[PDB]
Design a protein around this ligand. Structure first.
Ligand SMILES: [Cl-]
Ligand SMILES: [Cl-]
Lengths: 163, 727, 67, 103, 292
């Protein structure tokens, strides 16, 4: 790194005391990093606590409704097949998992300290094509736009080849 | 026993008689030079990541334009802070060349030429010339830079922006700088050739790289490639109007044959980012190449890949087996031997990883400079742009499968090594300490004994300077009752302590540097035979101590595959035609989609490793390039590609198990009867989706992805569609 | 003598430091592997809960009327 | 037990979590104290040995706070796992009962 | 000189058809006959254990000393027989599984209301063993897969501590014998089979159920005895990963896959435990080789 011992009094005691003070600061940093972890674990687990409770009470009163069921009186009507829609289970599909809004806070902070591209959008109002100046420098949506146009063209090329 | 050895023994008969503050100062200079290398690297990053601002600026079609002034005003507002970076760059390279050449002049003095220079500093000087090469090629490529400045210069003038004579001459110098091709390299030569004997220093630098490369004195791929790049640019600089590398070769001052062999075996290595360097170019463009063509064999390559990956894959897979089998077996106080073994494994593992990563990058590097065409690839369109011909169409199916194999074997071992860090760290520090203390306290007793006895005061001072610096005596005090200290022999035992801590950086640097001066009348002449071997031995083994002490950092550097995604160089070459390249030209997706498309069973458990390449590139864009837009684009690509990943994976997974079901229930007798009638109903090929289906938390771009949950969503929807169809 | 003494004390000082920093790293590693282990359990809990939610919605649909 | 879960969710985990944040602010204070106590110290060797004392104590503290909070989080997940176990059992009985009825 | 096609008598449709004809009574009688043949094989295995009781006892405690561990193995006899008999047991158990899975599907179709109660009753038990065998005997009669096979237990139940040691040593004997399979050309894993030509993939089922049965009879720790087995098996297989003999390592990678199968087949062993004593990267590469 730099130098060596010169045998002078209190030379060693001073540098190590600085080294130890830094270690204690690292433990201070470690205490905070642990929080961020246990925190994002608690948050999710705490959310499931809600759903669990909501479901439990939903299960409990259904367990009672079913008790009141009477086969002797239950009448069947054809209006269910005629006037009432059929049961549909949830069909939710998660997609676009890497939007900026899904970026975890820690990485977001590392991102903010990174260099931003030139403020080229300052010249946007002065363009004739009504386009954003920054898109001529960087355009993340370029990948999707090009892939989409490719799939449509490949859908046509493949469609007119059969004929 | 060689003939040379027998002759040396005979020569021994014919020869039978009938400061610390100094190193501290050198270490100061060395440390200072390194800081400038780091600074240059920052400028390299600025150039490589510099995209055209002018293209994003609305032009002035005619002098008669309403917003003419507004545009110009905004132009300066945007480009001014950027032009400042260019001024600083111009100033940096100017000062860097003076600094370097000033150091060359100092080491080339008639008297100093007879002096000793540490290997570490020659290397640093070597990295200096490479820095110049990198900066110059980056500057040569970036038309965007030159044009942006002109756009600023043209706007600042029309606006009559206040500027004093100094500011004007400053602007004028920048223009001339940005307009001159190979300016950095040309300035370097002028200031070098004015120094008498400069070619003698560069010869020392080159000879050292040749020695390291030949003897494997490097760990990471970048270290390996740096040696070659120094050899190349070195010879180039040594071949001018004042020096001649071929006459230098005749006097055996250098060995062009070895360098030629190295360049022939490895022809292309990364220079910076996706910008590669064809080593043989240094040779072909040298001042005296034309008259000495026959001297070289590396100048002939062709569009043919030199090595067969199939031969390479067999060995790699063998080494993967052999090493990991042993490592896995290593997962109260240990003995020195047991700690040494873990020490050896840590190094061997890092070396193995480096070889693999080097294989991948070197293949990729060669491909980039050798794009394919119709002649080599029938499916390669003649209109396809260079980058697509350099990547997408430049790999066969088997090549793409093999690359993912190596990538997976790399990342796989990296995980095992990482899990072993804590144990490694302890075993390494124990081993380095033991080796250092055993050498300084015991091994150096004999040499010191002879130096004192034969009044070799110069050697004695060095040996004592070493022992005084690092020795950690068990009694807290040196053994004053030592006979060797008086110069006499032993009738004597020393108890050497065992600590789990390595020496300080200064301690290790000083010891190695001083030992190096001994085995460098020379001091080496006054030393016995066996002792020189002992010193050479410790000096050789201690070369990797620093790497191992910083295991964590070294591990990452041996598994760096972050450059597969970056393509700013090729983007620049499109002259604004491309703001980016589509995903089909993107290596990470090329390698990943290939497995999804072919559904290759043998590769299905590897597919996540190729996808992990985005993490490497993302981390690199955030911590090294330090550019937001680069991450934005990586994230946007992952976002698109991962949706396709889930769709294709879930799709083939359902189809696979539907076919399995239909096959399991198909009447057996019917099968046999169809076979007997030449209409065999073919069985479904088995596959390997289980591991993918078990992934509950895929780490990608900071997110934790539950792949199982996503697949279930699609597969469930497929079940309902099947039922809906049947009914 | 004062230098030799300082060097022996430095070795001891640095070993102690190495011991602490080494422990700080084992804590950091636990935190990570603990984070991952809990991520798996949460996903498993989420998986089962979601299934139970769907199942309840299904059973309710069998015992109730439609729109 | 639901009581044990409420205790973990409302006090012990949030509490042991804040005790960790307190360690964050308290240790950076102890760090400055070790440097200030050394500056004002007439016995440098004495000041160092006391810093080492605070360092060792700081390590033992952080490891204890994490361990305590780790066990709490695990106990929480174990309880929630059994909740789903009992709920599935109840849902299955409801399902069987409905099947009997429809038949 | 076979006169029949096995697949036309033992495939899913066939075993289901068989279950239709035999029902719970018949299929239960079928399994009883199977377990008898297994008892016979276990009886012979014990002889091989007793015949090597000394060496095996040493190998069990000297598991971390390669040199001695290797020298001890050479003193073992009837290694092939141990592997051969355990494989037979695995095959028989594999058949029973096919029969039980077929029976299960058939019963869920004919007697859903009874099956519904049997499933709920087996899944949610606390627990005593003698009372668990009663819940398990009922369950298996309905084709439900059990962690402990009641029929197997009964079959193997026909000094108390002398017997326990044998069971323990049996696990050791098998664990240290696996590497031998690598020298057999037939130990080749086939993607078409999703198993090995010589049925050694059935060892996964044999090792698990025999352990669960024996260490239930002797009231030991199934989980601990299998943990020990895995460690000893992983250790033995890792050692051959550094050898070069084209013969002894011919099917090294195919034999490696057994460890994956053994863990998948066993509810007492987890992938995490396997990872800590045998990295999956080895298994990954192993699968790649056989699937390519
Ligand atoms: Cl197949
Ligand atoms: Cl059926």
């Amino acid at each position: 790194h730099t130098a060596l011992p010169r045998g002078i009094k209190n030379e060693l005691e001073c540098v190590t005391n600085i080294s130890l003070a830094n270690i204690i600061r690292q433990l201070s940093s470690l205490s905070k990093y642990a929080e961020d972890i246990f925190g994002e674990l608690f948050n999710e687990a705490h959310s499931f606590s809600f759903r669990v409770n909501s479901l439990q009470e939903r299960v409990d009163r259904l367990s009672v409704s079913v008790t009141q069921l009477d086969p002797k009186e239950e009448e069947l009507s054809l209006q269910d097949i005629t006037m009432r829609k059929a049961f549909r289970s949830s069909t939710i599909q998660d997609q676009q998992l890497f939007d900026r809004k899904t970026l975890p806070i820690p990485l977001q902070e590392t991102y903010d300290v990174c260099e931003q591209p030139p403020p080229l959008n300052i010249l946007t109002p002065y363009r004739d094509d009504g386009k954003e100046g920054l898109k001529f420098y960087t355009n993340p949506s370029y990948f999707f736009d090009l892939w989409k146009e490719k799939m449509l063209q490949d859908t046509e090329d493949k469609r007119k080849e059969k004929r | 026993v060689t003939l040379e050895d027998a002759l040396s023994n005979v020569d021994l008969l014919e020869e039978l008689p009938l400061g610390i503050a100094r190193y501290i100062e050198q270490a100061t200079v060395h440390s200072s030079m390194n800081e400038m290398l780091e600074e240059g690297q920052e400028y390299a990053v600025m150039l490589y990541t510099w995209r055209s601002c002018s293209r994003a600026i609305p032009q002035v079609k005619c002098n008669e334009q309403p917003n003419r002034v507004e545009i110009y005003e905004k132009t300066v507002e945007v480009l001014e802070p950027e032009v400042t970076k260019l001024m600083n760059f111009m100033y940096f390279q100017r000062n860097a060349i003076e600094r370097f050449c000033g150091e060359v002049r100092r080491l080339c003095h008639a008297e100093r030429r007879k002096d000793f220079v540490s290997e570490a500093y020659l290397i640093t000087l070597g990295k200096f010339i490479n820095m110049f090469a990198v900066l110059d090629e980056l500057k040569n490529m970036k038309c965007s830079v030159k044009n942006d400045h002109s756009a600023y210069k043209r706007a600042a003038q029309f606006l009559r922006k206040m500027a004093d004579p100094q500011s004007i001459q400053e602007s004028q110098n920048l223009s001339m700088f940005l307009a001159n091709h190979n300016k950095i390299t040309q300035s370097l030569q002028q200031q070098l050739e004015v120094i008498s004997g400069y070619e003698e220093l560069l010869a020392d630098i080159v000879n050292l790289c040749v020695d390291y490369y030949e003897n494997r004195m490097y760990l990471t791929p970048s270290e390996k490639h740096m040696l070659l790049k120094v050899m190349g640019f070195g010879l180039y600089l040594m071949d001018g109007s004042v020096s001649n590398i071929y006459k230098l070769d005749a006097k055996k001052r250098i060995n062009l044959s070895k360098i030629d062999k190295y360049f022939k075996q490895l022809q292309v290595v990364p220079l910076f980012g996706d910008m590669q360097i064809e080593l043989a170019r240094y040779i072909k463009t040298s001042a005296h190449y034309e008259e000495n063509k026959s001297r070289w064999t590396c100048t002939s390559s062709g569009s043919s890949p030199q090595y067969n990956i199939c031969e390479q894959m067999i060995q790699i897979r063998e080494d993967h087996m052999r090493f990991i089998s042993e490592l896995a077996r290593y997962s109260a106080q240990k003995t020195d031997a047991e700690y040494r073994k873990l020490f050896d494994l840590a190094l061997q593992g890092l070396q193995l990883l480096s070889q693999w990563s080097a294989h991948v990058m070197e293949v990729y590097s060669w491909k980039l400079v050798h794009p394919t065409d119709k002649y080599s690839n029938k499916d390669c369109p003649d209109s396809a742009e260079e980058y697509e011909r350099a990547t997408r169409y430049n790999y066969t199916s088997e090549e793409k499968f093999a690359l993912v194999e190596v990538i997976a074997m790399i990342k796989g071992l990296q995980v095992l090594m990482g899990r072993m860090e804590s144990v490694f760290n302890h075993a390494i520090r124990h081993t380095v300490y033991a080796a250092l203390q055993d050498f300084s306290q015991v091994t150096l007793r004999e040499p010191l004994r002879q130096a004192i006895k034969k009044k070799k005061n110069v050697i004695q001072s060095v040996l004592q300077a070493i022992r005084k610096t690092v020795c950690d005596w068990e009694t807290g005090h040196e053994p004053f009752n030592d006979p060797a200290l008086r110069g006499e022999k032993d009738p004597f035992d020393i108890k050497v302590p065992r600590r789990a801590v390595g020496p300080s950086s200064t301690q290790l640097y000083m010891v190695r540097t001083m030992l190096e001066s001994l085995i460098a009348k020379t001091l080496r002449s006054s030393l016995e035979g066996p002792t020189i071997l002992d010193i050479e031995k410790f000096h050789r083994e201690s070369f990797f101590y620093t790497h191992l002490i910083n295991f964590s950092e070294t591990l990452q550097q041996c598994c760096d595959l972050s450059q597969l995604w970056f393509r700013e160089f090729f983007l620049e070459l499109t002259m604004g035609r491309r703001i980016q390249f589509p995903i089909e030209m993107s290596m990470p997706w090329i390698l990943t989609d290939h497995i999804l498309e072919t559904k290759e069973a043998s590769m299905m458990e590897y597919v996540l490793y190729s996808l992990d390449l985005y993490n490497d590139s993302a981390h690199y864009a955030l911590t090294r390039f330090n550019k937001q837009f680069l991450y934005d684009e990586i994230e946007a690509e992952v976002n698109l590609c991962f949706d396709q990943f889930v769709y294709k994976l879930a799709d083939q997974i359902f189809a696979y198990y539907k076919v399995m079901a239909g096959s399991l229930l198909l009447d057996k007798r019917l099968r046999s009867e169809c076979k007997n009638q030449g209409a065999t109903i073919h069985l479904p090929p088995s596959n390997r989706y289980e591991t993918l289906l078990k992934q509950r938390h895929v780490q990608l771009l900071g997110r934790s992805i539950d792949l199982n949950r996503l697949i279930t969503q699609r597969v469930s929807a497929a079940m309902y569609k099947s039922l809906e169809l049947a009914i | 003598d004062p230098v030799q003494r300082e060097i022996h004390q430095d070795w001891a000082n640095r070993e102690y430091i190495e011991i602490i920093t080494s422990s700080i790293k084992k804590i950091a590693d636990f935190l990570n592997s603990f984070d991952m282990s809990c991520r798996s359990r949460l996903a498993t809990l989420n998986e089962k809960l979601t299934a139970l939610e769907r199942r309840i919605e299904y059973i309710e649909a069998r015992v109730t009327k439609g729109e | 037990a639901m009581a044990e879960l409420q205790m973990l969710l409302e006090e012990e985990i949030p509490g042991g979590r804040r005790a960790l944040f307190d360690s964050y602010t308290n240790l950076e204070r102890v760090a400055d104290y070790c440097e200030n106590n050394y500056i004002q110290s007439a016995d440098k060797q004495r000041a160092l040995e006391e810093t080492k004392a605070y360092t060792t104590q700081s390590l033992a503290s952080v490891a204890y706070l994490i361990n305590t909070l780790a066990n709490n989080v695990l106990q929480m997940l174990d309880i929630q796992a059994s909740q789903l176990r009992r709920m599935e059992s109840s849902i299955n009985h409801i399902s069987q009962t409905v099947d009997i009825h429809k038949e | 000189e076979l006169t029949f096609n096995a697949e036309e008598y033992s495939d899913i449709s066939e075993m289901r058809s068989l279950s239709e004809l035999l029902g719970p009574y018949g299929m239960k009688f079928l399994s009883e006959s199977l377990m008898w043949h297994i008892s016979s094989q276990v009886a012979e295995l014990k002889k091989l254990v007793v015949e090597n009781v000394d060496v095996l006892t040493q190998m069990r405690t000297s598991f971390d000393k390669p040199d001695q561990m290797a020298a001890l193995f050479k003193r073992l006899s009837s290694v092939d027989s141990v592997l051969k008999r355990m494989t037979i047991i695995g095959v028989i158990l594999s058949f029973r599984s096919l029969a039980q899975e077929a029976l299960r599907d058939v019963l869920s179709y004919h007697i859903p209301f009874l099956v519904s109660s049997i499933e709920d009753f087996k899944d949610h038990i606390p627990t005593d063993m003698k009372v668990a065998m009663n819940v398990y005997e009922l369950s298996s009669a309905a084709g439900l897969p059990c962690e402990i096979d009641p029929a197997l237990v009964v079959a193997l139940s026909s000094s108390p501590e002398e017997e326990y040691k044998i069971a323990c040593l049996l696990m050791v004997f098998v664990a240290v014998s696996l590497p031998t399979l690598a020298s057999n050309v037939m130990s080749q894993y086939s993607p078409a089979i999703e198993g090995h030509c010589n049925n050694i993939h059935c060892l996964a089922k044999a090792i698990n159920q025999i352990a669960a049965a024996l260490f239930t009879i002797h009231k030991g720790s199934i989980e601990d005895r299998l943990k020990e087995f895995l460690a000893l098996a992983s250790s033995s297989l890792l050692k051959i990963g550094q050898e070069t003999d084209k013969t002894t390592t011919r099917n090294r990678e195919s034999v490696y896959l057994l460890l994956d199968m053994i863990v998948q087949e066993s509810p007492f062993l987890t992938m995490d435990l396997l990872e800590s004593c045998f990295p999956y990267v080895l298994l990954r590469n192993a699968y790649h080789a056989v699937y390519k």
